[PDB]
Amino acid sequence: MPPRKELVGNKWFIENYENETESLVIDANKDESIFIGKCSQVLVQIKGKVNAISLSETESCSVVLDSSISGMDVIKSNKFGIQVNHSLPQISIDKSDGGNIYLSKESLNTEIYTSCSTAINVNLPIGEDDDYVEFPIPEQMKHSFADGKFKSAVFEH
Amino acid sequence: MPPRKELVGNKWFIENYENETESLVIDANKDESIFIGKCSQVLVQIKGKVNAISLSETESCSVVLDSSISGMDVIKSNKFGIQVNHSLPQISIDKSDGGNIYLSKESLNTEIYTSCSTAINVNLPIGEDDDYVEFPIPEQMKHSFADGKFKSAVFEH
């Protein structure tokens, strides 16, 4: 499949891009949604508010965005990168290995949901001098019956 | 590779068994360890206390055991089954889809650790009349900054 970058109605499709030296810019509108799939070594830059964002089946791809009304979902993506300039309510990550997320102050409270994902780090601008601070995302859960009840918990060493 | 069922020193290896109509019985000793790999549609029955148990790369395989000193680990196993007659300290489950665990009263407090696993259920003999009660194992985690701190938690709907 050859490189695809088209707006179909209110849906943008960015697919089949390989080793892109230049940033792939999308001047989007708040009613549009972004779908990025089957891309490798590419940086997608979304300018302007959008309704939703999806990153699917990608390798070493990075996404720079302003804001997303409904959020963003990441599936089967390895070594991905996400940078939010404004904000989004949530980011879902599934079956992905390696990922680095950088949140802006406005987007500090973004919810992150993970499933079968590894090497995921979230960076918050809460260090000294606006500097980022990294938070590695835990991957295991512990489950057992105790104190009369069966409970699940995030495993922490 | 042809069917393998041999004790090498203090290590039992059960591999390459396919559609076994009969239970594969292992009369083991407390100083021995059990490794079950590359098997499909097989029920392994371990009689006697053992040091450890491993179920690796299996499909529709079930394991019946008495007790394990160090526990049991399950990796890349789908539609697996585990039944503990006595007890073990823990069971680790990784990259596995579909699994059903039945714990005895003695083994009621067994710790279960999961990683990239799905459709996992744990049954405790805590219902009425010794009857089992099923506990589906949660698969997602939620992470966010709140109340001055970034925290992770098991997602519950």
UniProtKB/Swiss-Prot annotation, chains A, B:
Top-level taxon: Eukaryota
In the record, Phosphoserine modifications are located at: 87
Instruction: Domain (C-CAP/cofactor C-like): give its ranges.
Output: 2-137
Query: Which stretches of sequence are listed as region Dimerization and actin-binding?
Result: 3-157
Instruction: Describe the function of this protein.
Output: The N-terminal domain binds to adenylyl cyclase, thereby enabling adenylyl cyclase to be activated by upstream regulatory signals, such as Ras. The C-terminal domain is required for normal cellular morphology and growth control.
Family, per entry:
Belongs to the CAP family.
Q: Note the subunit structure.
A: Homodimer.
Q: State any further remark.
A: Present with 8760 molecules/cell in log phase SD medium.
Q: What is this protein called?
A: Adenylyl cyclase-associated protein
